Amino acid sequence: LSPQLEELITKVSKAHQETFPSLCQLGKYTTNSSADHRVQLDLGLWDKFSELATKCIIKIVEFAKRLPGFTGLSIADQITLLKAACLDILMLRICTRYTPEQDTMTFSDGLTLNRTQMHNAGFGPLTDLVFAFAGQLLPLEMDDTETGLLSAICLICGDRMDLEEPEKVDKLQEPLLEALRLYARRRRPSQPYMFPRMLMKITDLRGISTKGAERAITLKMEIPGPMPPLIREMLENP
Ligand SMILES: CC1=C(/C=C/C(C)=C/C=C/C(C)=C/C(=O)O)C(C)(C)CCC1
């Protein structure tokens, strides 16, 4: 139904907004920690970072629980999808919080770190790639609903291994693909390549997140304690 599609767009949009404040709504604040230059790892920063990442994962789970039919999958599947797409979405999220002018990224509490600090916080040799991926997201000029829809598409993917009902997941993803094309084309009929362009960006995102996963490895060797529990759950995945 057209009305059905219109409401799916609103629901997803709202769940995204409610679980992820736009840069504009944030009371930005900074820190002086290792703003100087790049070091292997700033623990005070990784600490603030892992806390913000953990709270983010919880917000992603809340977002997933609010997508139509997610909650209808078996618990096994809900966890499988969450584990498999969580890093992707965490990456899409901070990359949409990037300010080209200041070359910064803002987290959900307003904490705004420059490139050096993102590096020092744990991104290590992967920070410039993340920043370059973020920069390449800019031309897409996506709004909160498109970002919300793109996220719902990354998460509800029936091609993950270990899925008990891939078929149900594929049926759930379908309307999301439709809502995004309709919405994207309605908003910008002047540029019909936006929809396939956003879709192709899913592939890029899966490439940076796999590199993010590799970074968690070396990072594990570098921190003085185990990584936060929810972060560990996320990184245990096929
Ligand atoms: C967990 C983790 C990583 C990525 C974190 C990301 C992508 C966090 C996003 C946070 C947001 C988006 C916070 C907020 O909005 O407050 C990297 C790649 C360093 C590897 C080590 C463990």
Query: What residue ranges do the domains of the chain occupy?
Result: 1-238
Degrees, nearest 5: CA angle 120-155-204: 55
Which of 43, 58, 90 is the best mutation target for the ligand 1 pocket, counting ligand atoms within 8 Å of the beta carbon and taking the most? 90
The answer to whether the beta carbons of residues 236 and 83 sit under 8 Å apart is yes
3-state DSSP of the chain: CHHHHHHHHHHHHHHHHHHCCCHHHCCCECCCCCCCCCCCCCHHHHHHHHHHHHHHHHHHHHHHHCCCCHHHCCHHHHHHHHHHHHHHHHHHHHHHCEECCCCEEECCCCEEEEHHHHHHHHHHHHHHHHHHHHHHHHHHCCCHHHHHHHHHHHHCCCCCCCCCCHHHHHHHHHHHHHHHHHHHHHHCCCCCCHHHHHHHHHHHHHHHHHHHHHHHHHHHHHCCCCCCHHHHHHCCCC
Q: Is 93 in the pocket of ligand 1 (CB under 6 A)?
A: yes
Q: Is 176 in the pocket of ligand 1 (CB under 6 A)?
A: no
* Residue bearing the CA closest to ligand 1, atom 18: 212
Distance 181 CA to ligand 1 centre (A): 28
**Which atom of ligand 1 sits closest to the CA of residue 53?**
10
- The CATH architecture annotation of domain 1-238 reads Orthogonal Bundle (1.10)
Distance 23 CA to ligand 1 centre (A): 16
Distance 127 CA to ligand 1 centre (A): 11
Q: Is 130 in the pocket of ligand 1 (CB under 6 A)?
A: no
Q: Is 122 in the pocket of ligand 1 (CB under 6 A)?
A: yes
Distance 109 CA to ligand 1 centre (A): 14
The three-class DSSP label of residue 113 is: strand
Q: Is 12 in the pocket of ligand 1 (CB under 6 A)?
A: no
Distance 77 CA to ligand 1 centre (A): 23
Which of 22, 93, 237 is the best mutation target for the ligand 1 pocket, counting ligand atoms within 8 Å of the beta carbon and taking the most? 93
Nearest to 20 by CA among 72, 60, 65: 60
Q: What's the rounded Cα separation, in Å, for the pair 148 and 89? A: 10
Q: Is 119 in the pocket of ligand 1 (CB under 6 A)?
A: no
Q: What's the rounded Cα separation, in Å, for the pair 135 and 57? A: 23
Distances (CA, A) of 3 to 8, 9, 78, 103, 110: 9, 10, 27, 41, 36
Degrees, nearest 5: CA angle 77-231-80: 10
Distance 107 CA to ligand 1 centre (A): 9
CA 109 from centre of chain: 16
* Resolution of this entry, Å: 2.1
Structural determination approach:
X-ray
